[PDB]
Design a protein around this ligand. Structure first.
Ligand SMILES: Cc1nc(Nc2ncc(C(=O)Nc3c(C)cccc3Cl)s2)cc(N2CCN(CCO)CC2)n1
Ligand SMILES: Cc1nc(Nc2ncc(C(=O)Nc3c(C)cccc3Cl)s2)cc(N2CCN(CCO)CC2)n1
Lengths: 115, 115, 115, 115
């Protein structure tokens, strides 16, 4: 599994469950093409987005729908979504774990890249 | 000044100086119209992006060129840029400060919304 | 002002106002000697903690009473306090700004060290 | 396993391996008594610190030796250590995952608490 995303809720101290996200890949014409999508599990994780064969070199964007998450909890947040844009597999295949920590007016994101 | 951006460097413990960013406003056709841009000062701040009259409600995107910043320091970064996407809403006199804390493989962003 | 503290609230998107904190200096017997204290202002800042003459090299601890802050807002917090422990070192004229971003189950802290 | 700690390196985008930490519990005389200690594995995780029976109600402090970690990588960091102080099991047994994200001049910590 070369691309996993983990989302945490900093207000409740819990995984962020049922968080939708869409992954896009930059096409040769500079447009964002849809690549994969899903929602986080009870553990706040989203696995199985892609495979090593499909996950070629490129610029990828993960758009995490944080706004819908907060609204469902009764909170009007600042951000429309959290966005994570990165070049992947530029030096050969890697495994990427994208983590996001969510608050109503703030978010942090980090990446762990393993060979 | 209805919109200010402050950028900090978590590796050097300093303001992030000379960081370029562009601000976009979402158009009716769902495309990003360039709105304002600049580079952070020696204090890591960028002021004078817009005026109260021009800064109407809508969806705005601040795209911070973090990749060029880390490249200038000789440090290999993860992200292509840091993106802050938010809805501006008229609820009394509001001033927006977008703060961003930068590390090579991570970034955090917060909004301070005051009167 | 060789030492300033700025505290932000990631739930409300605002400075964290009226947050009490104590600063300690580590003594030879490895105990924490009270050094300075105060409460953050309406801008979430606390100035005037020490002077250049008094702020000698050593190990310092800033203990931020985040628990009382969240209790005042009716929000159940995780941490008893936020602690920032650091060595102050004389390498040219240096001013320290300790920034802290608060959520109920998370906090981040950064140091901005300038001349 | 009721207490686990996970540490990430935001400069390298990797687990923070071989990070020492000590856990203390506040005694009835208001002193910090040693409770458990260990170092993070190749995955940046520390498991097996305690058991449900031993991990009684109390105020606990996790002191993560971040300074030694950065110095071994050739970096002189700001903080002496990262400190996480919290009341545990106040409403009955819980499982606590403490996460820390490390940069030379900044750290963030969060907690996931599960029943
Ligand atoms: C050193 C400094 N820091 C400022 N503000 C902030 N510092 C840090 C911020 C912040 O949130 N950090 C952060 C953290 C800690 C964790 C995760 C993510 C993040 Cl992003 S916000 C403002 C400031 N000023 C000087 C005085 N000017 C007078 C104008 O009248 C005002 C502006 N100087
Ligand atoms: C690299 C990695 N990180 C994991 N957990 C966390 N990553 C980051 C965490 C976190 O909170 N970051 C953070 C952020 C984002 C901001 C501020 C502050 C912080 Cl601290 S917590 C889990 C994990 N797994 C690999 C796949 N395994 C099998 C599938 O279940 C087990 C899970 N891999």
């Amino acid at each position: 599994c070369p691309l996993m995303v983990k989302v945490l809720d900093a207000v409740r101290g819990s995984p962020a469950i049922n968080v939708a996200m869409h992954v896009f890949r930059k096409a040769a014409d500079d447009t964002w093409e849809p690549f994969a999508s899903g929602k986080t599990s009870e553990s706040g994780e989203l696995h199985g987005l892609t495979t090593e064969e499909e996950f070629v070199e490129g610029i990828y964007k993960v758009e995490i729908d944080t706004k819908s998450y907060w609204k469902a909890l009764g909170i009007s947040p600042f951000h429309e979504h959290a966005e994570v844009v990165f070049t992947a597999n530029d030096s050969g295949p890697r495994r990427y774990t994208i983590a996001a920590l969510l608050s109503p007016y703030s978010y942090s994101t980090t990446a762990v890249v393993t060979n």
